[PDB]
Design a protein around this ligand. Structure first.
Ligand SMILES: [Cl-]
Ligand code: NA
Ligand code: NA
Ligand code: NA
Ligand code: NA
Lengths: 460, 216
DNA sequence: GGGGTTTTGGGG
DNA sequence: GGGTTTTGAGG
DNA sequence: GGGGTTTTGGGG
């Protein structure tokens, strides 16, 4: 196989050509009719990546690749921009001014995906190691072969890809629309925003909280199975989105079956600048707390920085598999999300009891200091997406006698029967926690069959 | 101001404990909607979303009477006008019914609809499943949250708090996590079902039967 | 044999 | 090809 | 023509 560069490919030969390129954009593999699937992507290389810079505005130049197949599984799923793709037997032709490569995978064409970063998106999600730096993480047909002479091409293209993404935006301003101008678009458009929050709406749907450089905040629904790489604090490019005119309560973006959410390789200059430039926004949350019914979810808590990298475990696994799963049994500290349905005891004033560290007994402070050290003994009855339909409510404890979750309410324990200020703060918190669309992101430590909240504090 | 007639209607129906007599009267007017599909699923749109209309055995017979030269299962891309319709909540298996969510469904009961044959409608955005809409899904989640929270505050009582001595000095203490599982209501099965709204009931025809009735 | 493809009947 | 299937909760 | 396959020379 002889590999040609994008800009040097023949437009007249019309013969099958092969090449290596960097994928900067791609749609999701979508079905067009009863027997065809398509995946359109944008590709670049050392000979084609930027338009005549002088009046171009540092706009990225590129060729397009359209892969056709009879099956979904025969097309490449591009989760991240910057990776490399190797195509075989592709015919090139001029399409409205630009070099368009076409390949019928259903016939004799083939593709292979190579990771530019150490690991591929899928490998990072599963914390796996790549067989080698010459092994494709995905490819069409049953087999894929990499000749010795290719290694040089692949390695060099990787070195170039990083230099490219760290030196240029790649996804130039002309490749997407500002969220605060999204309502002015006639149809679909592209977005480049930071993921401020990933809310698990239900068993199969994630609701992303986006905010781009324009400062505008938007929400959009992302299926878990389709986009399992979405992560809070990460910058992504959304291919094809539309402004929802029917959403009056909040700004929402609609995605189609061909829409795609794409992340950037580590060396991405754009992704780096945006991760630091775009700062978290809580305006939406604060405003919703003034309404009796908020269609906007509100994460009332924030876990200690040291746990920010800890993976979340659903209530389903926490209460139904924590004693039968090998992996779950090995852990004593977990992170999870849920919404409070009810708080016990009912009387907020009894949230703080007196504790005798010698007899290991607590008691009401309605009689005063004659009970010992003041501590929180709150029993949350929660539920989550994984247990949304069952007839259960799960108990999550906030017993601070040993220091776990002492500063959860941002209010030091105290006789709530005498300290009006302390009581009022806790009462307001009580209403927020039990309010619809309010959720808690917290770290819990399993102790004698129960889960106690720790290193978790309210941010409202 | 909600632009989607369907979204508004279905939303108020839910925010009104499934009581159709409580929903705004200024919304119970004839519904002119575009037919996106007719088989195997009959889906109509209001310009923004699509919903599955449930025709009564009466509605279809009346239709075939006034329009002999018209087959319902062939109204795709055509427009129809529902003069007499009603809404009602129903418990379903969202795993099988894609026009539902959280095992709940708001049905569009059709009693009488005229087929405005060959009427070109204005261009609109691609229609999406209402029960897949972010806001509508959330509205339904609010509905269950209110039902669930009420049921729990009626079922759980006495402040049966875990004895602090259990979570303290747990050096030589082991326990099963399921001990934190509390029943939300007096529901019979393992699925919550303690709702106050009274599940509407009305005989409706399966799109398959109307197919055989027009072509065995 | 049967696809896609153009070889439009025949290689390995 | 900057697009629209059903598998109708990757498509 | 050339794959994968078995048809192992020939259809559409
Ligand atoms: Cl234990
Ligand atoms: Na042929
Ligand atoms: Na042949
Ligand atoms: Na052959
Ligand atoms: Na053969």
């Amino acid at each position: 196989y002889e590999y040609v560069e994008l800009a040097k490919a023949s437009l007249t030969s019309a013969q099958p050509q092969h090449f290596y390129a960097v994928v900067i954009d791609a749609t999701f593999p979508y079905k067009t009719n009863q027997e065809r699937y398509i995946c359109s992507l944008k590709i670049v290389d050392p000979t084609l990546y930027l338009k005549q810079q002088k009046g171009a505005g540092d706009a990225s130049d590129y060729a397009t690749l359209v892969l056709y197949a009879k099956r979904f599984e025969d097309l490449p799923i591009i989760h991240r921009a910057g990776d490399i793709i190797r195509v075989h037997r592709a015919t090139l032709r001029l399409y409205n001014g630009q070099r368009q490569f076409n390949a019928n995978v259903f016939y004799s064409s083939s593709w292979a995906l190579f990771s530019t970063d150490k690991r591929s998106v899928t490998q990072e999600i599963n914390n796996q190691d790549a067989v080698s730096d010459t092994t494709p993480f995905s490819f069409s047909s049953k087999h894929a072969t990499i000749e010795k002479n290719e290694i040089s091409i692949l390695q060099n293209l990787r070195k170039w890809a990083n230099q490219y993404f760290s030196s240029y935006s790649v996804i130039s301003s002309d490749m997407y629309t500002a969220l605060n101008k999204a309502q002015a678009q006639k149809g679909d458009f592209d977005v480049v925003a930071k993921i401020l929050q990933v809310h698990e709406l239900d068993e199969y749907t994630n609701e992303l909280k986006l905010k781009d450089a324009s400062g505008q905040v938007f929400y959009t629904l992302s299926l878990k199975l389709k986009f399992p790489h979405v992560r809070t604090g990460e910058v992504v490019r959304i291919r094809s989105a539309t402004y929802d005119e029917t959403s009056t309560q909040k700004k929402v973006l609609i995605l189609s079956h061909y829409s795609n959410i794409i992340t950037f390789i580590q060396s991405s200059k754009l992704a780096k600048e945006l991760r630091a430039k775009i700062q978290d926004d809580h305006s939406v949350e604060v405003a919703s707390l003034k309404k009796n019914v908020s269609l906007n979810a509100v994460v009332l808590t924030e876990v200690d920085k040291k746990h920010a990298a800890l993976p979340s475990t659903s209530l389903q696994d926490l209460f139904h598999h924590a004693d039968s799963d090998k992996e779950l049994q090995a852990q004593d500290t977990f992170r999870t999300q849920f919404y409070v349905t009810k708080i016990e005891p009912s009387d907020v004033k009894e949230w703080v009891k007196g504790y005798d560290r010698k007899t290991k007994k607590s008691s009401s402070l309605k009689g005063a200091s004659g009970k010992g050290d003041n501590i929180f003994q709150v029993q949350f009855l929660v539920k989550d997406a994984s247990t949304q339909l069952n007839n259960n409510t799960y108990r999550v404890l906030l017993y601070t006698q040993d220091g776990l979750g002492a500063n959860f309410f941002n209010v030091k324990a105290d006789n709530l029967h005498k300290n009006a200020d302390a009581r009022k703060k806790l009462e307001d918190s009580a209403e927020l926690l039990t309010k619809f669309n309010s959720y808690v992101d917290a770290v819990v430590e399993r102790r004698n069959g129960f889960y106690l909240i720790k290193d978790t504090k309210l941010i409202y | 101001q909600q632009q989607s007639a369907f979204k508004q209607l279905y939303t108020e129906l839910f925010n009104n404990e499934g009581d159709f007599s409580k929903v705004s009267s200024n919304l119970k007017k004839p519904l002119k909607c575009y037919v996106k599909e007719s088989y195997p699923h009959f889906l109509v749109t209001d310009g923004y979303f699509f919903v599955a209309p449930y025709f009564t055995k009466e509605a279809v017979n009346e239709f075939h009477a006034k329009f002999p030269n018209v087959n319902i299962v062939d109204l795709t891309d055509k427009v129809i006008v529902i003069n007499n319709w009603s809404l009602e909540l129903r418990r379903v298996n969202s795993a099988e019914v894609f026009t539902s969510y959280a095992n709940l469904e708001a049905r569009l009961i059709v009693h009488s609809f005229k087929p405005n044959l060959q009427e070109r409608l204005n261009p609109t955005r691609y229609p999406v499943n209402l029960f897949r809409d972010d806001e509508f899904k959330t509205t339904i989640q609010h509905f269950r949250h209110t039902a669930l929270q009420a049921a729990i505050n009626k079922t759980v009582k006495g402040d049966n708090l875990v004895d602090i001595s259990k979570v303290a000095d747990a050096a030589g203490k082991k326990g099963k996590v399921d001990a934190g599982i509390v029943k939300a209501s007096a529901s019979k099965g393992d699925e919550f079902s303690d709702f106050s709204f009274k599940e509407g009931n009305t005989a409706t025809l399966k799109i398959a039967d109307i197919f055989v009735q027009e072509k065995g």
